[model samples]
Target chain A: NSVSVDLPGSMKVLVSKSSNADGKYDLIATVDALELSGTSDKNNGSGVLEGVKADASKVKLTISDDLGQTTLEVFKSDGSTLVSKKVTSKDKSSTYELFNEKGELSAKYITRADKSSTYELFNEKGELSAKYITRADKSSTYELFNEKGELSFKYITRADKSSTYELFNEKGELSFKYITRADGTRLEYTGIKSDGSGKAKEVLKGYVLEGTLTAEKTTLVVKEGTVTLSKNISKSGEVSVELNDTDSSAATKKTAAWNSGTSTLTITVNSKKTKDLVFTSSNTITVQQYDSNGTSLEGSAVEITKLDEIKNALK
Target chain B: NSVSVDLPGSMKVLVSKSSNADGKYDLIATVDALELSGTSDKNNGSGVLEGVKADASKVKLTISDDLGQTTLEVFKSDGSTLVSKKVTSKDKSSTYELFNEKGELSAKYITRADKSSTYELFNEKGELSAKYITRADKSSTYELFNEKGELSFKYITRADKSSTYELFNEKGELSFKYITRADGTRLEYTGIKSDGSGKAKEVLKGYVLEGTLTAEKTTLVVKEGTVTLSKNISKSGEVSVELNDTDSSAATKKTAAWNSGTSTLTITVNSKKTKDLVFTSSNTITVQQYDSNGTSLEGSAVEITKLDEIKNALK
Candidate 1:
């Protein structure tokens, strides 16, 4: 078929020689459905195709390079670029970008690089909404942005397989980070202290303010909370707080030694025997010793509030 | 033109009039370049196209439904399904699924539903690697999973414009949650306590242990840390402490009252005047007075350890 015609809408029809080995005519048909071939001699081993609407607006266009790069662009009927893609022959690496009808960049993706790739999405106002990145080490990072384009959250995975997720406040200040490693996972909060110090202090180590009282090895322990007794008795038997005295001899001279360092009180009934009482807090303490034989006694609790006397009793 | 032929390679071609208003023929060309039209009468306004290689392997296929659903499936040269897509006409809702060459599901995406959409990606072991969900209210959530498909992190943006990001450990236990609201952003850590209680206790509020001492409003204040004194002296004449006594009288009876409730000590030198001293911690206190003319004095630091005596001294 050898027909060449100059059409009305500023168009041309060419009955081109066959580029295929089987010897078939290549048709340069209607603009609405034209197919372009890259092997044509006139195209220098490359090709350019334009999809033009009747109104003379280029709706879509593609350029194929001999060096194995292809760029495709699609435009709105009004000629505004709506989307575009560029691909390289190497592993089909490509860059694709999307634009709104108003010509605002809505999203973009780049995947052609050998070791790095990135995708970015934009909000209605063209602010970066989200971004994902893969670096040379095969690690990846994802970041989300608020409407204002302030970074809100970031998720990162390293080549070593550890992951960290970080959250940010509206001001872009790092508010929290959760990190996972081979050893363990942990969450940390970063905020300004009351004293205006920039520090990430660990969550409070709660105190056992109130605990059950138990005795072990003849030692009284305030195992829960901290409280101190305030009194010392020489000898008073028939106690309301009853306990079978391991050695119930009323004539044992009782002496108490307080160790401020250990927060423990050592009660010595004799040079050879002693009982230990521990206080959770280092405030104050006094003890009551009852004698079953009912010897000397003191009823009212007394004060021993001097720090030096408590320190001197360390012996 | 009317041509119908069955070829030796198990193929058929028919030159049939197209449904297009124009009197052109629909070409049923080679299978490699065959383009199926949905309007063909034999297909009942739908079309099915198969891309088969010379080896009789189905490389790709596409099915179009008359009511507006289209399914596309692509297979590896080995005939294993590599990728598939199903799309609906209603605003182009679609589902896309991808498989590795070995036929393992690698990723999937679903869109086109009126209210929601989802995307799921899998790891090398076919475990869920990541997921993203968009709800009816226009809110979205993204979640990442470890190689074991255990949830690692979740980011959620609600319709109300609030956002929450939660991170989990390998055991899928939520370790941290960052919440952003109209009011402010906050970071929280959830973990098991040493006592085995699963409670999200806040980080510790530090205490001011030691602070400077200052006097204001005729009161002594432990402006920084908490410390208490212990000692009381009656009188001494030669004063080493240079404090101008607002009222100086040798016959004045200096009385001290302790307000355990407010941690304040009220010192009244006369019926008309009093000075207050505040203690940060509820511990002990003692006073010293110097009589310039010299009268009585106590040299030793004594103890006021009894609680009731301090309580009785409240008056």
Candidate 2:
């Protein structure tokens, strides 16, 4: 027998003969047009149709219309809404909202008119926990919020291939920023110090550092204060200082020179007096003094056995 | 009429009732007893079960027995084994294996006799990619392998509340180790240098660093051979050094003392010569020389205008 029953709102039920040849009828409908009260126990297993005992408030799928917008809502077995989806024809946009078992909104995703999308996640109390945004310009941003709904961290990328990340403190103040530009990446501390001052100090340039160089045989030791010798040292090599600044106003102005070939150490004091301490292979030092005019002073030659005695005589 | 069809392997098919009473009957069986060739169109949804047109080689579930081990296997629609679970009654041990659609063993989990479990994951080529081991003593170890199955990184936590992590190079050589013990954590670089030497060089402890001290109207400047002046200097205050090591063999043996009250700077040279350079309010420097016996030498006192002249006279 073929029986057709018309229901409200353009719904229909149709019954037909069974393929098993048992002199009985079965209900048939299209995939999208079927609606039933209770679910099957064998879940995805094929066989014949049978009606089982079903509760009144079981899992349900409903389509509703509000303000010219249609939404498809899926309810859990306990009658709590699980997923809500809404799509609009005016702007080609869609939204998908997911809820917890208690019907609280947990996550939501929305697409805008320009094909840009945003996803927001909420905590158990429905407060915004995190958000991700994809813009029409192919840029993206992801942000995480603290328990109090304050933005804690944000990661953003631009369409021009640049990117940046920022971290905020509990009070939503920016603590750090990491930016990647066309040149290179930069890490900046954007926080303030405990004294209410900026975190970055004033870095002064052109401050001359006075370091001493001592050579024992071929090994040179460079010392700057009382800390320790620099680890970057070669065991044996010629040590040379390249004084490139010849300008008198330069902080690196040369005031002394040593000629290895002549074994001479020349000291220029305040551009006025010149003293040449000469050394020979016989372990004797010769102090030759000159006036401001570079003329060798008469009777100024002195011989000493120790190099320390020459400096003492100059003083 | 109720009909029962018996099978050869203790399986049966029973046809029974049409609750709608359309003069036909449907198939009924227990939840654990029913078997089907094809799945239904609507999954886990309310309504009657419906058979969908399926392929010849479709997704399947099968149970097999081998050597007292019963394994339940699930196959994908392409006839490839998806998941395999084997349980034994001997030692309560079980194994779960998962395979990719290409029939490659992708992951496996095994519980041993002592309740310790291990999980292993494989790459596309069936190579060991990573593994996690959980011991019966509540300790765990996680290891990651390179493409060639060489250990690349390992993280281990012991039952004694200690933990360790190790990273390996491409050649399976240990490069770094991080160990957390009862006291604190230690990070060590375990790799060797390119020159086949240990990564750490010998560090000497007793090397003395000689630094200079200068004062201009109570503003002290501490300088070592010449880097820049110390940033930790006070604009105007007394600068003192605590000479703690008084032993003769100590490298920090006291060699100089300064008395701010009397404006005296005492210098001890090689435990043999003592020189006291005294400063007066009128800027005259008085030099007092002493022998090793602490006796003041005759005619040793000299009055000079500049302090540098007194030092030169002492030398």
**Which candidate gets the maximum lDDT versus the true structure?**
2
Sequence-dependent TM-score of model 2 = 0.26
Q: Which parts of model 2 have CA positions greater than 4 angstroms off?
A: A1-68, A78-90, A192-315, B1-315
Global lDDT scores for all candidate models: 0.43, 0.45
Task: Provide per-model DockQ scores.
Answer: 0.00, 0.00
How does each model score on TM-score?
0.29, 0.26
lDDT of 1 at B118: 93
What are the runs in model 1 whose C-alpha is more than 4 Å off? A1-315, B1-43, B52-65, B87-91, B192-315
Write down the worst ten-residue block by lDDT for model 1 chain B. B233-242
Q: Itemize residue pairs with steric clashes in candidate 2.
A: A38-B46, A38-B47, A39-B46, A210-B226, A210-B227, A211-B226, A211-B227
